[PDB]
Amino acid sequence: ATLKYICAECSSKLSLSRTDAVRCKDCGHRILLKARTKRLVQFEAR
Amino acid sequence: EEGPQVKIREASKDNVDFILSNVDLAMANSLRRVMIAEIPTLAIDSVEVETNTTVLADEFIAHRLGLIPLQSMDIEQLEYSRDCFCEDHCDKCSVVLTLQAFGESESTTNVYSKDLVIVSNLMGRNIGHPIIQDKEGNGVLICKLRKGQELKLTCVAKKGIAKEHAKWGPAAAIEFEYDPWNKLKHTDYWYEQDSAKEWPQSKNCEYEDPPNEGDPFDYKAQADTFYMNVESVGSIPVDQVVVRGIDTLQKKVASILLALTQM
Amino acid sequence: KVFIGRLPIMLRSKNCYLSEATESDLYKLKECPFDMGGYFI
Amino acid sequence: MIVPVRCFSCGKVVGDKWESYLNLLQEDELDEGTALSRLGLKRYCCRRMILTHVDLIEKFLRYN
Numbered sequence: 001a002t003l004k005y006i007c008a009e010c011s012s013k014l015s016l017s018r019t020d021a022v023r024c025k026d027c028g029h030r031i032l033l034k035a036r037t038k039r040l041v042q043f044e045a046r
Numbered sequence: 047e048e049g050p051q052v053k054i055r056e057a058s059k060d061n062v063d064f065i066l067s068n069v070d071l072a073m074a075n076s077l078r079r080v081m082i083a084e085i086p087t088l089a090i091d092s093v094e095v096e097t098n099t100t101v102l103a104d105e106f107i108a109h110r111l112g113l114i115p116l117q118s119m120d121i122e123q124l125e126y127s128r129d130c131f132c133e134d135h136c137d138k139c140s141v142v143l144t145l146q147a148f149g150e151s152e153s154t155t156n157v158y159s160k161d162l163v164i165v166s167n168l169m170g171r172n173i174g175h176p177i178i179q180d181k182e183g184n185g186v187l188i189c190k191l192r193k194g195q196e197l198k199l200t201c202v203a204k205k206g207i208a209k210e211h212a213k214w215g216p217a218a219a220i221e222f223e224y225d226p227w228n229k230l231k232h233t234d235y236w237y238e239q240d241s242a243k244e245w246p247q248s249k250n251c252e253y254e255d256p257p258n259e260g261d262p263f264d265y266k267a268q269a270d271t272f273y274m275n276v277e278s279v280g281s282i283p284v285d286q287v288v289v290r291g292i293d294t295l296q297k298k299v300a301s302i303l304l305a306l307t308q309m
Numbered sequence: 310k311v312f313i314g315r316l317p318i319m320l321r322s323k324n325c326y327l328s329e330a331t332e333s334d335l336y337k338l339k340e341c342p343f344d345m346g347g348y349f350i
Numbered sequence: 351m352i353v354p355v356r357c358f359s360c361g362k363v364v365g366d367k368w369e370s371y372l373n374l375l376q377e378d379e380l381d382e383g384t385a386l387s388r389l390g391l392k393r394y395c396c397r398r399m400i401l402t403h404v405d406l407i408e409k410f411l412r413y414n
């Protein structure tokens with residue numbers, strides 16, 4: 001049950017937004033990573 | 047059996063050295079070119095990436111997948127995807143392979159092409175299988191993971207010709223020489239003090255009589271004998287690079303007769 | 310004591326964390342062990 | 351970054367030869383050229399492939 005954001009540093013699915021802050025849950029680090037679509041992506045291998 | 051004559055001198059699962067004897071240069075070079083360019087073969091040509099936490103990018107990985115040579119002895123019995131009436135791909139035009147890896151160990155986990163699982167129905171045509179030629183039976187190294195890292199993919203293979211991309215080529219290098227002594231004066235040798243001291247003798251000279259200094263040049267001679275050596279990467283055994291080579295030409299020419307008929 | 314300012318500090322100077330660090334420490338910190346310092350951020 | 355799968359020039363697979371090449375140097379003590387010739391990489395195109403690879407992924411794998 002879901003993903004949305006990731007912690008750059010302490011590696012851990014966060015998920016949040018606006019009035020929420022921009023930090024963390026179990027390191028306090030201000031840097032977040034967007035996290036991969038589930039729409040599936042195809043490559044031609046050429 | 048009159049005509050173009052053959053004469054194997056060596057053979058091996060991997061190479062076949064031979065001598066064509068009684069043919070034109072054109073046919074000999076043409077069969078060279080076909081072996082390089084137009085024998086059908088099977089190769090990953092679509093890759094869907096569910097997960098890659100790997101230190102390589104996806105297209106980097108994908109590209110590498112299209113290059114792993116995949117069994118292709120039964121490839122006449124796979125239709126070209128563009129000729130098939132399916133929507134997209136299916137079992138008549140495609141093998142589908144899977145790849146999952148996870149770096150479970152502390153130490154670094156390699157991903158090899160044996161880790162490739164076929165997932166589609168082969169109808170017992172010998173195709174699809176990653177080819178493996180190393181003592182340890184690992185085949186090709188695709189990637190490397192660190193503890194925590196994951197990669198999950200699917201691939202579809204498809205029949206293809208090296209014209210279209212070299213991954214579909216069965217042949218590797220093709221040695222090809224003629225007239226080792228230079229008797230035909232097809233080439234004119236650069237040198238500082240002496241052409242013969244300075245150029246190395248081909249191995250193919252033993253096979254063929256040195257010329258004698260008197261001998262006024264032979265204007266009528268033609269290039270009739272060719273020292274070849276075809277080397278296979280393994281998706282098709284060798285003898286079969288040649289024979290499907292000869293066979294591919296013969297079909298190109300016939301599509302020309304067929305199309306005179308249709309005029 | 311009494312603050313008077315902020316000094317931009319040159320990478321790999323004695324004052325910057327990286328100058329004492331080992332090779333492992335540089336990988337944990339996401340700093341290429343081949344970077345050589347001598348500039349400011 | 352990794353051993354390339356084939357010789358750019360002749361197509362020979364060469365990506366199944368990296369662990370062996372490196373075993374043949376460190377474990378059985380051959381010089382780089384004797385080693386390459388043992389894995390059957392005899393044209394200078396393929397030899398250049400292994401001899402000049404740089405396995406940068408071994409550095410990339412030290413990051414977390």
Ligand SMILES: [Zn+2]
Nearest residue numbers: 007010024027
């Ligand atoms: Zn965190």
Ligand SMILES: [Zn+2]
Nearest residue numbers: 130132136139
């Ligand atoms: Zn189909």
Ligand SMILES: [Zn+2]
Nearest residue numbers: 357360395396
């Ligand atoms: Zn080569």
